[PDB]
Amino acid sequence: KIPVALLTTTGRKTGQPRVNPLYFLRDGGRVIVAASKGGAEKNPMWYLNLKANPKVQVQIKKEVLDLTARDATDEERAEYWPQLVTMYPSYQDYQSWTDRTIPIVVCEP
Ligand SMILES: C[C@H](OP(=O)(O)OC[C@@H](O)[C@@H](O)[C@@H](O)Cn1c2nc(=O)[nH]c(=O)c-2cc2ccc(O)cc21)C(=O)N[C@@H](CCC(=O)N[C@@H](CCC(=O)O)C(=O)O)C(=O)O
């Protein structure tokens, strides 16, 4: 239905690789994900991990991409958020129900 990307982050405490499935957009070499965690009030751990260890790896089907993750800028959110919402409308609910602003993470070559 919606394909997932596998995001590997380095544990910001343990240093161990952690892998999580996420929905994604691809734009010009970038992989974009949202740290929505089903509308939970706290950011997911993988987001905390990539804040401490920006080098991540993303696997989409066969491709294994070595990327550097960062938060979307305001202008990027305005471009990507509607695309994410179009793809998976629940994102908009999750954003409504959560106090924190749901991070949009841009992973770049
Ligand atoms: C529960 C925790 O996961 P998390 O990193 O908080 O991520 C929560 C969710 O985002 C994650 O489960 C997503 O995969 C859920 N999820 C999506 N989550 C999203 O946020 N966005 C999505 O688009 C998304 C899509 C999706 C599709 C299918 C599916 O099955 C799940 C999907 C986890 O895996 N904990 C591990 C590892 C935790 C970890 O990374 N530890 C760090 C320390 C972290 C710290 O305490 O600071 C370390 O090793 O050093 C553990 O405790 O054993």
Numbering used by the authors: 43 to 151
Task: List passages from the publication reporting this PDB structure.
A deazaflavin-dependent nitroreductase (Ddn) from Mycobacterium tuberculosis catalyzes the reduction of nitroimidazoles such as PA-824, resulting in intracellular release of lethal reactive nitrogen species. The N-terminal 30 residues of Ddn are functionally important but are flexible or access multiple conformations, preventing structural characterization of the full-length, enzymatically active enzyme. The split barrel-like fold is characterized by a central six-stranded antiparallel β barrel in a Greek key topology with four α helices: A at the N terminus (the putative helix removed for Ddn structure determination), B after an extended loop between strands β3 and β4, and C and D between strands β5 and β6. The identification of these residues and the lack of classic catalytic residues in the active site suggest that Ddn functions primarily by precisely orienting PA-824 for efficient direct hydride transfer from F420 and potentially through additional transition-state stabilization.
Cocrystals of the NΔ40 construct with oxidized F420 were also obtained in two space groups and were solved by molecular replacement (Holo-1 in C2 at 2.1 Å resolution and Holo-2 in P21 at 1.8 Å resolution, with an rmsd for one chain of 0.3 Å over 109 aligned Cα atoms). Although the F420 preparation included larger polyglutamate tail species, only two glutamates could be visualized (F420-2), consistent with the structure of FGD1 crystallized with a similar preparation (Bashiri et al., 2008) and the recent observation that F420-2 and F420-5 bind with similar affinity to Ddn (Gurumurthy et al., 2012). The crystal packing combined with crystallographic symmetry operations reveals the same decameric ring structure in both structures, with five monomers in the ASU of Holo-1 and ten in Holo-2 (two rings per ASU). Although the decamer structure includes extensive intersubunit packing, its relevance to the native quaternary structure and function remains unknown because of the difficulties of studying the full-length enzyme. In structures Holo-1 and Holo-2, F420 binds to a groove on the surface of Ddn through a series of hydrogen bonds and several salt bridges between positive charges on Ddn and the negatively charged phosphate and tail of the coenzyme. The last visible glutamate of the F420 tail lies near the β1-β2 hairpin within hydrogen-bonding range of the side chains of R54, T56, and R60 as well as the main chain of K55 and T56. The more proximal glutamate H bonds with the side chain of N91 from helix B. The phosphate of F420 sits near the complementary positive charge of K79 and H bonds to the amides of M87 and W88 from the loop after strand β3. The deazaflavin ring system is stabilized by H bonds with the main chain of A76 and K79 and the side chain of Y133 (helix D). Additionally, there are waters in both costructures that mediate interactions between protein and coenzyme.
